[PDB]
Coordinates of C-alpha atoms in Angstrom, one line a residue:
Chain A
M3 CA 153.1 70.1 -136.6
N4 CA 149.1 70.4 -135.4
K5 CA 147.0 72.5 -133.4
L6 CA 144.1 71.0 -131.3
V7 CA 144.3 67.8 -128.7
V8 CA 142.0 65.4 -127.9
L9 CA 142.6 62.5 -125.5
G10 CA 139.8 60.4 -125.0
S11 CA 138.0 56.6 -125.5
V12 CA 137.6 54.9 -128.2
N13 CA 134.8 52.4 -128.0
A14 CA 132.0 50.6 -130.5
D15 CA 128.5 50.1 -128.9
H16 CA 126.4 46.7 -129.5
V17 CA 122.4 47.7 -130.3
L18 CA 119.9 44.6 -130.5
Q19 CA 116.1 45.2 -130.1
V20 CA 115.0 42.5 -127.6
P21 CA 111.2 41.8 -127.3
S22 CA 111.5 43.0 -123.6
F23 CA 114.2 42.5 -120.1
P24 CA 116.2 39.5 -120.1
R25 CA 116.3 37.4 -115.8
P26 CA 118.2 33.9 -115.3
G27 CA 117.8 30.8 -117.1
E28 CA 116.1 31.4 -120.7
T29 CA 117.8 33.9 -123.6
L30 CA 116.2 36.5 -126.0
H31 CA 115.5 36.8 -129.7
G32 CA 116.5 40.7 -130.3
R33 CA 115.7 41.9 -134.1
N34 CA 117.8 45.5 -135.8
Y35 CA 121.2 44.5 -134.9
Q36 CA 123.3 47.4 -135.2
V37 CA 126.9 48.4 -134.1
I38 CA 127.5 52.6 -134.4
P39 CA 130.8 54.5 -133.7
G40 CA 131.1 56.2 -130.0
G41 CA 132.6 56.6 -127.1
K42 CA 133.3 60.8 -126.4
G43 CA 136.7 61.1 -127.1
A44 CA 136.1 59.7 -130.0
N45 CA 132.4 61.7 -130.9
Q46 CA 134.9 65.1 -129.3
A47 CA 136.8 64.8 -132.6
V48 CA 135.4 64.0 -134.6
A49 CA 132.7 66.4 -134.0
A50 CA 135.1 69.2 -133.2
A51 CA 137.3 67.7 -137.7
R52 CA 134.4 68.1 -139.5
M53 CA 134.2 71.6 -138.3
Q54 CA 137.9 71.7 -140.6
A55 CA 140.5 71.4 -137.0
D56 CA 143.5 71.5 -137.5
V57 CA 143.0 68.4 -134.5
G58 CA 144.9 65.1 -133.6
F59 CA 144.0 62.9 -131.0
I60 CA 145.0 60.2 -128.8
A61 CA 142.7 57.9 -127.7
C62 CA 144.3 53.0 -127.8
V63 CA 141.6 51.1 -130.3
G64 CA 142.4 47.4 -130.2
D65 CA 143.5 45.4 -133.8
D66 CA 140.0 43.4 -133.7
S67 CA 139.6 44.6 -137.0
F68 CA 137.0 46.9 -135.7
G69 CA 139.5 48.5 -133.5
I70 CA 140.9 49.7 -137.2
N71 CA 138.0 50.2 -139.1
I72 CA 138.6 52.9 -136.8
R73 CA 141.6 54.2 -136.9
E74 CA 140.9 54.9 -141.1
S75 CA 137.2 56.4 -139.9
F76 CA 138.4 59.0 -138.0
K77 CA 142.0 59.6 -140.7
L78 CA 139.9 60.2 -143.3
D79 CA 137.3 63.0 -141.0
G80 CA 140.3 65.3 -140.9
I81 CA 142.1 63.8 -137.7
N82 CA 145.6 63.0 -136.9
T83 CA 145.4 58.9 -136.6
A84 CA 149.7 60.0 -134.8
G85 CA 148.4 59.2 -131.4
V86 CA 146.2 57.0 -131.9
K87 CA 147.5 53.5 -131.3
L88 CA 147.3 50.1 -130.9
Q89 CA 147.1 47.4 -127.7
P90 CA 147.5 44.3 -129.1
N91 CA 145.1 41.7 -128.2
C92 CA 142.8 43.6 -126.6
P93 CA 139.7 44.5 -128.4
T94 CA 138.1 48.3 -128.5
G95 CA 135.4 49.7 -126.1
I96 CA 132.5 47.9 -125.8
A97 CA 128.7 48.3 -125.3
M98 CA 126.1 45.7 -124.4
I99 CA 122.6 47.8 -124.7
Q100 CA 119.4 45.6 -124.6
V101 CA 116.4 46.5 -125.9
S102 CA 113.5 48.3 -123.9
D103 CA 111.8 49.3 -126.3
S104 CA 109.3 48.3 -123.4
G105 CA 110.7 50.3 -121.1
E106 CA 114.1 51.0 -120.2
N107 CA 117.9 50.7 -122.1
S108 CA 119.5 47.8 -120.2
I109 CA 123.2 49.0 -120.6
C110 CA 126.7 47.3 -120.1
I111 CA 129.8 49.0 -120.8
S112 CA 133.1 47.2 -121.5
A113 CA 136.4 49.6 -121.1
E114 CA 138.8 47.4 -122.8
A115 CA 141.6 48.6 -125.1
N116 CA 140.5 52.4 -123.5
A117 CA 141.9 51.5 -120.0
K118 CA 145.3 51.7 -121.8
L119 CA 145.5 55.0 -121.7
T120 CA 148.2 56.0 -119.3
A121 CA 150.9 58.2 -118.0
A122 CA 154.4 56.2 -120.0
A123 CA 151.3 55.4 -122.8
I124 CA 151.5 58.9 -124.8
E125 CA 155.3 60.1 -123.4
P126 CA 155.1 60.5 -127.2
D127 CA 152.4 62.6 -127.3
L128 CA 153.1 64.7 -125.1
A129 CA 155.1 67.2 -128.0
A130 CA 151.6 67.9 -129.9
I131 CA 151.0 67.7 -125.9
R132 CA 152.9 71.5 -125.5
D133 CA 153.4 72.1 -128.9
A134 CA 149.3 72.3 -129.4
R135 CA 147.6 74.8 -128.4
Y136 CA 144.6 72.9 -127.2
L137 CA 143.5 70.3 -125.4
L138 CA 139.7 68.3 -124.3
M139 CA 139.4 64.9 -123.0
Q140 CA 136.2 63.2 -120.9
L141 CA 136.6 60.6 -118.6
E142 CA 136.1 57.2 -120.2
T143 CA 139.5 57.4 -119.6
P144 CA 141.6 56.6 -116.5
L145 CA 142.8 59.9 -115.2
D146 CA 146.4 58.6 -114.4
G147 CA 146.8 59.1 -118.7
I148 CA 143.9 62.1 -117.8
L149 CA 146.5 63.6 -116.1
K150 CA 150.6 63.6 -117.2
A151 CA 148.4 65.3 -120.9
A152 CA 147.9 68.5 -118.7
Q153 CA 150.4 68.3 -116.4
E154 CA 152.7 68.3 -119.2
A155 CA 151.1 71.7 -120.7
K156 CA 150.8 73.3 -117.9
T157 CA 153.2 74.2 -117.2
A158 CA 154.3 74.2 -121.0
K159 CA 151.3 76.1 -121.7
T160 CA 148.2 75.1 -123.7
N161 CA 144.3 75.9 -122.4
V162 CA 142.6 73.3 -121.1
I163 CA 139.5 71.8 -121.6
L164 CA 137.2 68.7 -119.2
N165 CA 134.0 67.1 -120.0
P166 CA 133.1 65.4 -117.1
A167 CA 131.0 63.1 -118.3
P168 CA 130.9 60.6 -117.9
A169 CA 129.6 61.3 -114.2
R170 CA 132.6 60.7 -111.7
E171 CA 134.8 62.5 -109.1
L172 CA 138.5 64.1 -109.5
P173 CA 141.0 64.9 -107.6
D174 CA 141.8 68.2 -106.8
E175 CA 145.4 68.9 -108.5
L176 CA 143.4 67.6 -111.6
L177 CA 141.3 70.4 -111.8
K178 CA 143.7 73.1 -110.7
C179 CA 144.9 72.3 -114.0
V180 CA 141.9 72.6 -116.0
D181 CA 141.3 75.8 -117.9
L182 CA 137.5 75.1 -118.1
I183 CA 134.5 72.6 -117.3
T184 CA 131.5 72.0 -118.8
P185 CA 129.6 69.6 -116.8
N186 CA 126.1 68.8 -117.0
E187 CA 123.4 69.2 -114.4
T188 CA 123.1 65.8 -112.8
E189 CA 126.9 65.0 -113.1
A190 CA 128.3 68.4 -111.6
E191 CA 126.6 67.7 -108.6
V192 CA 128.1 64.6 -108.9
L193 CA 131.3 66.4 -108.7
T194 CA 131.4 69.1 -105.8
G195 CA 127.8 68.5 -103.9
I196 CA 125.6 70.9 -105.4
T197 CA 121.9 69.8 -106.9
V198 CA 121.9 72.6 -110.2
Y199 CA 118.3 72.9 -111.0
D200 CA 117.3 77.2 -111.3
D201 CA 120.1 80.5 -111.9
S202 CA 120.8 81.3 -108.1
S203 CA 121.7 78.0 -107.1
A204 CA 123.6 77.4 -110.5
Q205 CA 125.9 79.9 -109.6
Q206 CA 127.0 77.7 -105.5
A207 CA 128.6 75.3 -108.5
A208 CA 130.9 77.2 -110.3
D209 CA 132.0 79.1 -106.6
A210 CA 132.5 75.7 -105.8
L211 CA 134.2 74.9 -109.1
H212 CA 135.9 77.8 -109.7
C213 CA 137.7 78.0 -105.8
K214 CA 139.6 74.4 -107.3
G215 CA 141.7 76.1 -109.7
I216 CA 139.8 76.6 -113.0
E217 CA 139.9 79.4 -114.9
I218 CA 136.4 79.6 -116.9
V219 CA 132.6 76.9 -115.7
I220 CA 130.5 76.0 -118.2
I221 CA 127.1 73.6 -116.5
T222 CA 124.7 72.2 -120.1
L223 CA 121.8 73.0 -117.8
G224 CA 120.3 71.8 -121.0
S225 CA 116.8 72.0 -122.7
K226 CA 117.4 75.6 -121.4
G227 CA 120.5 76.9 -121.0
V228 CA 124.5 77.0 -121.1
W229 CA 126.2 78.6 -117.5
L230 CA 128.9 80.0 -118.2
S231 CA 131.3 81.8 -115.7
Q232 CA 134.1 83.3 -116.2
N233 CA 135.6 83.5 -112.3
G234 CA 132.1 83.5 -111.3
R235 CA 130.4 86.0 -114.1
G236 CA 127.9 83.4 -113.7
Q237 CA 125.4 84.0 -117.1
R238 CA 123.0 82.0 -119.3
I239 CA 122.7 81.3 -122.7
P240 CA 118.9 80.5 -123.8
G241 CA 119.4 78.0 -126.8
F242 CA 117.0 76.3 -128.9
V243 CA 113.2 75.7 -128.8
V244 CA 113.8 73.2 -132.1
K245 CA 112.1 69.5 -132.8
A246 CA 114.3 67.2 -130.2
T247 CA 115.1 64.0 -132.0
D248 CA 118.0 61.4 -129.3
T249 CA 120.7 62.1 -127.5
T250 CA 123.7 60.5 -128.3
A251 CA 126.1 63.4 -129.3
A252 CA 125.2 66.1 -128.5
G253 CA 126.7 67.3 -125.3
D254 CA 129.4 65.0 -127.7
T255 CA 129.3 67.9 -130.3
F256 CA 128.5 70.8 -128.7
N257 CA 131.4 69.7 -126.2
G258 CA 133.1 68.7 -129.2
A259 CA 132.0 72.4 -131.3
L260 CA 132.8 74.7 -127.8
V261 CA 136.6 74.0 -128.8
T262 CA 136.5 74.8 -132.2
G263 CA 135.7 77.5 -131.3
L264 CA 138.2 79.1 -129.6
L265 CA 140.6 77.9 -131.7
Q266 CA 139.5 80.1 -134.5
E267 CA 139.6 83.0 -132.6
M268 CA 136.1 83.1 -131.5
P269 CA 135.2 84.4 -127.3
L270 CA 133.7 82.8 -125.8
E271 CA 129.3 84.2 -125.7
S272 CA 130.0 83.3 -130.0
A273 CA 130.6 80.3 -129.6
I274 CA 128.6 78.4 -127.3
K275 CA 126.3 79.6 -129.9
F276 CA 128.0 78.7 -132.3
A277 CA 128.8 75.2 -130.2
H278 CA 124.8 75.1 -129.6
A279 CA 123.4 75.5 -133.6
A280 CA 126.1 72.0 -133.2
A281 CA 123.8 70.9 -130.5
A282 CA 120.6 71.4 -131.8
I283 CA 120.8 71.1 -135.4
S284 CA 122.4 67.7 -135.1
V285 CA 119.9 67.1 -132.2
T286 CA 117.5 66.0 -135.3
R287 CA 119.7 63.8 -136.3
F288 CA 120.4 60.4 -134.4
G289 CA 123.0 58.0 -134.3
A290 CA 126.1 58.8 -133.4
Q291 CA 128.3 59.7 -135.7
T292 CA 125.7 60.5 -138.0
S293 CA 124.5 63.2 -136.5
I294 CA 127.3 65.6 -136.4
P295 CA 126.7 68.3 -138.8
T296 CA 130.0 70.3 -140.6
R297 CA 130.5 73.9 -141.1
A298 CA 129.0 75.0 -144.0
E299 CA 126.2 73.7 -142.0
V300 CA 126.4 75.3 -138.6
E301 CA 127.0 78.2 -139.8
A302 CA 124.2 78.4 -142.6
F303 CA 122.3 77.2 -139.4
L304 CA 123.3 79.8 -137.9
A305 CA 121.8 82.3 -140.3
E306 CA 118.9 81.0 -140.4
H307 CA 118.1 81.9 -137.6
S308 CA 118.7 85.2 -136.0
Chain B
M3 CA 131.2 17.1 -154.9
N4 CA 131.7 16.7 -151.1
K5 CA 130.9 13.1 -149.0
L6 CA 128.7 15.1 -146.6
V7 CA 126.7 18.0 -145.9
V8 CA 126.1 20.2 -143.0
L9 CA 123.3 22.4 -142.9
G10 CA 123.1 24.9 -140.4
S11 CA 123.9 28.6 -137.8
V12 CA 126.5 30.4 -137.8
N13 CA 126.8 33.1 -134.8
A14 CA 129.2 34.8 -133.2
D15 CA 129.4 35.6 -129.5
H16 CA 129.8 38.6 -127.2
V17 CA 130.6 36.7 -124.1
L18 CA 131.6 39.9 -121.5
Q19 CA 131.3 39.0 -118.2
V20 CA 129.0 40.9 -115.2
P21 CA 129.6 41.0 -111.8
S22 CA 125.5 41.6 -111.2
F23 CA 122.7 40.4 -113.1
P24 CA 122.0 43.2 -115.9
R25 CA 118.6 45.4 -114.6
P26 CA 116.9 49.0 -115.9
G27 CA 118.1 52.1 -115.5
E28 CA 122.0 52.9 -115.4
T29 CA 125.0 50.7 -116.8
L30 CA 127.2 47.8 -115.6
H31 CA 131.6 48.4 -115.8
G32 CA 131.6 44.9 -116.8
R33 CA 135.5 43.0 -117.9
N34 CA 137.5 40.3 -120.1
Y35 CA 134.7 40.6 -123.1
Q36 CA 135.5 38.6 -125.7
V37 CA 134.3 37.3 -129.1
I38 CA 133.8 33.4 -129.5
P39 CA 133.2 31.9 -133.5
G40 CA 130.0 29.6 -133.1
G41 CA 126.7 28.3 -134.3
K42 CA 125.7 25.1 -134.1
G43 CA 125.6 24.7 -137.6
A44 CA 129.2 26.2 -137.6
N45 CA 130.4 24.1 -134.5
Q46 CA 129.7 20.5 -136.3
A47 CA 131.4 21.3 -139.8
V48 CA 134.0 22.9 -137.9
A49 CA 133.6 19.7 -135.7
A50 CA 133.4 18.2 -138.9
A51 CA 136.6 19.0 -140.7
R52 CA 138.4 18.7 -137.4
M53 CA 138.3 14.7 -137.6
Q54 CA 140.1 15.0 -141.6
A55 CA 136.2 14.7 -142.8
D56 CA 135.2 15.7 -146.9
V57 CA 132.7 18.4 -145.5
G58 CA 130.9 21.3 -146.9
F59 CA 129.3 23.7 -145.8
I60 CA 126.1 25.6 -146.1
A61 CA 124.6 28.1 -144.1
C62 CA 124.5 32.5 -144.2
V63 CA 127.1 34.2 -142.6
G64 CA 125.7 38.5 -143.1
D65 CA 128.8 41.4 -145.4
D66 CA 130.7 41.9 -141.7
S67 CA 133.9 42.1 -140.7
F68 CA 133.4 38.1 -139.2
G69 CA 131.0 37.2 -141.4
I70 CA 133.8 36.9 -144.2
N71 CA 136.8 36.5 -142.1
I72 CA 134.7 33.3 -141.1
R73 CA 134.7 32.7 -144.3
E74 CA 138.1 33.4 -145.0
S75 CA 138.6 31.1 -142.0
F76 CA 136.5 28.3 -142.9
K77 CA 138.7 27.4 -145.3
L78 CA 142.1 27.4 -143.7
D79 CA 140.1 24.4 -141.5
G80 CA 139.7 23.1 -144.4
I81 CA 135.9 23.7 -145.4
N82 CA 133.6 23.1 -149.0
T83 CA 132.5 27.8 -148.3
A84 CA 130.2 26.7 -151.9
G85 CA 127.1 26.9 -149.9
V86 CA 128.4 29.3 -147.9
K87 CA 126.0 32.2 -148.9
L88 CA 126.7 35.8 -148.1
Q89 CA 124.4 38.1 -146.9
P90 CA 124.6 41.6 -148.5
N91 CA 123.2 44.7 -146.1
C92 CA 123.1 42.5 -142.9
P93 CA 124.7 41.3 -139.9
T94 CA 125.0 37.1 -139.6
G95 CA 124.0 36.6 -136.1
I96 CA 124.8 36.8 -132.6
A97 CA 124.8 36.0 -128.9
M98 CA 125.1 38.3 -126.4
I99 CA 126.2 36.5 -123.6
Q100 CA 126.2 38.1 -120.1
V101 CA 127.9 36.3 -117.5
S102 CA 126.7 37.2 -113.6
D103 CA 130.6 36.8 -112.1
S104 CA 127.7 34.6 -110.5
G105 CA 124.3 33.7 -110.7
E106 CA 123.1 32.8 -113.3
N107 CA 123.7 33.6 -117.1
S108 CA 121.8 36.6 -119.9
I109 CA 123.4 34.2 -123.2
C110 CA 120.5 36.3 -125.6
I111 CA 120.3 36.0 -129.1
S112 CA 120.1 38.0 -132.9
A113 CA 118.2 37.0 -136.1
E114 CA 120.3 38.5 -138.7
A115 CA 121.1 36.2 -141.3
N116 CA 120.3 33.2 -139.9
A117 CA 116.7 33.6 -142.0
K118 CA 117.8 34.0 -145.2
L119 CA 118.3 30.1 -146.0
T120 CA 114.6 29.8 -146.6
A121 CA 113.6 26.5 -149.2
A122 CA 114.0 29.0 -152.3
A123 CA 117.5 30.0 -151.2
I124 CA 119.0 26.3 -151.4
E125 CA 118.4 25.2 -154.7
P126 CA 121.5 25.9 -155.8
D127 CA 122.2 23.4 -153.8
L128 CA 120.5 20.5 -154.3
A129 CA 123.3 19.9 -156.4
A130 CA 125.9 19.9 -153.4
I131 CA 122.9 18.3 -150.4
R132 CA 121.6 15.5 -153.5
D133 CA 125.7 13.4 -154.8
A134 CA 126.3 14.3 -151.1
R135 CA 125.6 10.8 -148.5
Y136 CA 125.2 12.4 -145.0
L137 CA 123.3 15.6 -144.2
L138 CA 123.2 17.2 -141.3
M139 CA 121.9 19.6 -140.0
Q140 CA 119.5 21.3 -136.6
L141 CA 117.2 23.5 -135.5
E142 CA 118.1 27.1 -135.3
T143 CA 117.6 27.9 -138.4
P144 CA 114.1 29.0 -140.3
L145 CA 112.2 25.6 -140.4
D146 CA 110.6 25.6 -143.8
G147 CA 114.7 26.0 -144.9
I148 CA 114.9 22.8 -143.4
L149 CA 111.9 20.6 -145.1
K150 CA 112.9 21.2 -148.8
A151 CA 116.3 20.2 -147.8
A152 CA 115.6 17.2 -146.2
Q153 CA 112.9 15.6 -149.0
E154 CA 115.4 16.3 -151.7
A155 CA 117.9 14.7 -149.6
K156 CA 115.7 12.0 -149.0
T157 CA 114.6 12.6 -153.1
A158 CA 118.3 11.4 -153.7
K159 CA 119.0 8.6 -151.1
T160 CA 121.2 11.0 -149.3
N161 CA 121.3 9.9 -145.6
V162 CA 119.6 12.6 -143.0
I163 CA 120.8 13.8 -139.6
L164 CA 119.2 15.9 -137.6
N165 CA 120.1 17.5 -134.1
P166 CA 116.5 18.9 -132.1
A167 CA 118.9 21.8 -131.6
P168 CA 117.4 24.3 -129.8
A169 CA 114.9 22.2 -128.6
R170 CA 111.6 22.6 -130.6
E171 CA 108.4 20.6 -131.2
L172 CA 108.5 20.4 -134.8
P173 CA 105.5 19.3 -137.0
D174 CA 105.4 15.7 -139.3
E175 CA 105.4 15.6 -142.7
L176 CA 109.0 16.1 -142.4
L177 CA 109.6 14.0 -139.7
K178 CA 109.7 11.3 -142.5
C179 CA 112.2 12.3 -143.9
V180 CA 114.2 11.3 -140.5
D181 CA 116.4 8.5 -140.9
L182 CA 118.2 9.2 -138.1
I183 CA 116.9 11.4 -134.4
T184 CA 119.7 13.4 -131.4
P185 CA 117.7 15.2 -129.2
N186 CA 118.3 15.0 -124.6
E187 CA 116.0 14.5 -122.2
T188 CA 114.7 18.3 -123.0
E189 CA 114.6 17.7 -126.7
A190 CA 111.5 14.8 -126.0
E191 CA 109.2 16.7 -124.2
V192 CA 108.6 19.1 -126.4
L193 CA 108.6 15.9 -129.0
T194 CA 106.6 13.1 -127.4
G195 CA 105.0 13.8 -124.5
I196 CA 108.1 12.2 -122.1
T197 CA 109.4 13.7 -119.5
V198 CA 112.4 10.7 -120.0
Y199 CA 115.2 10.1 -117.9
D200 CA 115.6 6.6 -117.8
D201 CA 115.4 2.9 -119.2
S202 CA 112.1 2.6 -119.0
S203 CA 111.2 6.0 -119.8
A204 CA 113.4 5.9 -122.8
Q205 CA 112.4 3.1 -124.9
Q206 CA 108.7 4.7 -124.4
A207 CA 109.4 8.9 -125.9
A208 CA 111.6 7.3 -128.9
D209 CA 108.8 5.0 -130.0
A210 CA 107.0 8.6 -131.1
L211 CA 109.7 8.8 -132.7
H212 CA 109.6 5.4 -134.6
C213 CA 106.3 6.7 -134.6
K214 CA 107.0 9.6 -136.2
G215 CA 109.3 8.3 -139.2
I216 CA 112.3 7.8 -137.2
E217 CA 114.7 4.9 -136.9
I218 CA 117.8 5.5 -135.0
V219 CA 116.9 7.6 -131.4
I220 CA 120.1 8.5 -130.0
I221 CA 118.7 10.1 -126.4
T222 CA 121.7 11.5 -125.2
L223 CA 122.7 12.7 -121.3
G224 CA 125.3 14.1 -121.0
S225 CA 126.6 13.3 -118.0
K226 CA 125.0 9.5 -117.1
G227 CA 125.1 8.8 -121.2
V228 CA 123.1 8.1 -124.7
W229 CA 120.2 6.1 -124.8
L230 CA 120.4 4.4 -128.2
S231 CA 116.9 3.1 -129.9
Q232 CA 117.0 1.4 -133.0
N233 CA 114.2 0.1 -133.9
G234 CA 112.9 -0.9 -130.0
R235 CA 115.6 -2.9 -129.5
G236 CA 118.0 -0.9 -127.9
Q237 CA 120.7 0.0 -124.6
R238 CA 122.1 2.6 -122.0
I239 CA 126.0 3.7 -123.5
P240 CA 128.5 5.3 -121.0
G241 CA 130.0 8.3 -121.9
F242 CA 133.8 8.5 -120.9
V243 CA 134.3 9.2 -117.1
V244 CA 134.8 12.8 -117.3
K245 CA 132.4 16.3 -117.5
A246 CA 131.3 19.0 -118.8
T247 CA 132.9 22.5 -118.8
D248 CA 131.5 24.9 -121.7
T249 CA 129.2 21.9 -123.2
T250 CA 128.7 25.1 -125.5
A251 CA 130.2 22.4 -128.4
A252 CA 130.7 19.6 -126.4
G253 CA 127.0 18.6 -127.8
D254 CA 128.4 19.9 -130.8
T255 CA 130.9 17.7 -131.8
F256 CA 129.5 15.5 -130.6
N257 CA 127.1 15.8 -133.2
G258 CA 130.1 16.4 -135.3
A259 CA 132.6 13.9 -134.5
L260 CA 129.5 10.9 -134.6
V261 CA 128.7 11.8 -138.5
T262 CA 131.8 11.7 -139.4
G263 CA 131.9 8.0 -138.3
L264 CA 129.7 6.9 -139.8
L265 CA 131.0 8.2 -143.0
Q266 CA 134.0 6.1 -142.6
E267 CA 131.8 3.6 -142.4
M268 CA 132.4 2.6 -139.2
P269 CA 129.3 0.2 -137.6
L270 CA 126.6 2.5 -135.7
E271 CA 127.7 1.7 -132.2
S272 CA 131.5 2.7 -132.9
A273 CA 130.3 5.8 -133.4
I274 CA 128.8 6.8 -130.8
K275 CA 131.4 5.6 -129.3
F276 CA 134.0 7.6 -131.4
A277 CA 132.1 11.7 -131.1
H278 CA 131.8 10.4 -127.1
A279 CA 135.5 11.4 -127.1
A280 CA 135.7 14.6 -129.4
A281 CA 133.1 15.0 -126.6
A282 CA 135.2 14.7 -123.5
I283 CA 138.0 16.2 -124.5
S284 CA 136.6 19.2 -126.5
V285 CA 134.2 19.0 -123.0
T286 CA 137.3 19.4 -120.6
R287 CA 138.1 22.4 -122.6
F288 CA 137.6 26.6 -122.0
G289 CA 135.9 28.0 -125.0
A290 CA 133.0 27.2 -126.6
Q291 CA 134.8 26.7 -131.0
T292 CA 138.0 26.5 -129.9
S293 CA 137.6 23.6 -127.1
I294 CA 137.5 21.1 -130.2
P295 CA 140.7 19.3 -130.5
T296 CA 142.6 18.2 -133.9
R297 CA 141.6 13.9 -135.4
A298 CA 144.7 12.9 -134.2
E299 CA 144.1 13.8 -130.8
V300 CA 140.9 12.4 -130.4
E301 CA 142.7 9.2 -132.0
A302 CA 145.2 8.6 -129.8
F303 CA 142.9 9.6 -127.2
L304 CA 141.4 6.3 -127.7
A305 CA 144.3 4.2 -127.4
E306 CA 144.8 5.1 -123.7
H307 CA 141.3 4.2 -123.0
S308 CA 139.2 1.7 -123.4

């Protein structure tokens, strides 16, 4: 059997470059069309697996031949595709982003197949949920599904991780079942109502978060730190003075790596440096699944910086 | 060697219902995304194949898990996949059609493989174009690709029909090589300067075409019917007492069937009627390249009316 479990949303991002934004009536001729596999659960697991983790994936994809072009694409990169199930006649999720590239980006996102990640949808995967040492999830899947996964674990012990991305709002009864949380400043706020900008206010979030049954709270503060708190012990990790590049996974690899730390007996602070490496290497990289570096890398990088 | 030859585009239509017209900044959670096979050049050759004709297709697709599956899909519909030149390291051509649930639409067109079709790319296809009796083509692929196709067709006594879709302004040198023309209200002004809305105005635009070397001029106006102007000796034709819902493949079925008619020796006057049926049956079906009826279906339909 397996030891790491990702529970999340695979989805293809349809990219096309246009000369300007749209408007009602006419049509735009586009250029450089590409499809980049994406979606948190898919990133935060290919992120893991490349660091050799003993990882399993729980996600829902469609039968639109791509949906199958990903169930292997995964399976090769280490990952156990057992709990990634094919939804019949539903496509895997999508993003239609017409580009500015003249300004900002118009994103139109569907959830399609990702909407089948429900309570009854992973009753067979609970086996793996319990016998696993960890569990990783983000909020691109329905809570109804994100929930049974958490609850099945806690009762039969397993630390549970939640990326609050993409930002929304959660019920208390759930955050109690989380043994961490790695929000981002602009998200993090919506979970409590505390605009994070400096060290002292960065602390108020945690306790407010902590107070909801959460042991560890690591709010990414982006270009400068990783606010860590183990029951209130707030800190700071100055990240990496490097040469940045695109957004992409970054917070997907980061969170993807942090869990790769914890499995190989690292203490958190040891991992957060490790994570921030991946979050520092592949941010000179770009794309999505194209960014993510290997163990050989990050470990080498850690050495190259001292 | 096949009797009818179609030259035109291929599309993939990425339609996803949007609930609010896209704007800058933030995203959107649309629903019910479908991938609907398309492209003018492609509807019409599929239209043709549905009316049991001898059709071959000359078009460009891509490596895409579509551009291959579509070519295999063609044959199961009886198509000469000869000239279906494929494209290495390139996606096909696409239409990103955002609904608005409602208000207005956002169709967004991408170039891609519908571009390789240049004068030079159809050279071994003269073989097909010359000995064939008809040539059907539209305006969604490169201009210099058609320009050569029309002339060697004419010089090889092969009839050429030009669907000027989508509407654009064209040079001479080519219009001297057309044997028949199929525009609408919107198409005429871009080539004859006439705003054409009724019988007196419809005779005048035509002439300009006539003055540009075009004999048979068929200006179709979906709702009100078609104005033919076969050398000035012209008339008005009521296309069946019907509607138009997915006019997408409507004027595509019209064009596919009309040439399918003329090919079976039908008189000009009778084939325009023939198409008018299939369009009238096509327009009542939801969907785009799925809104196309079978021959028996159209033929039987004809009996039921008069």
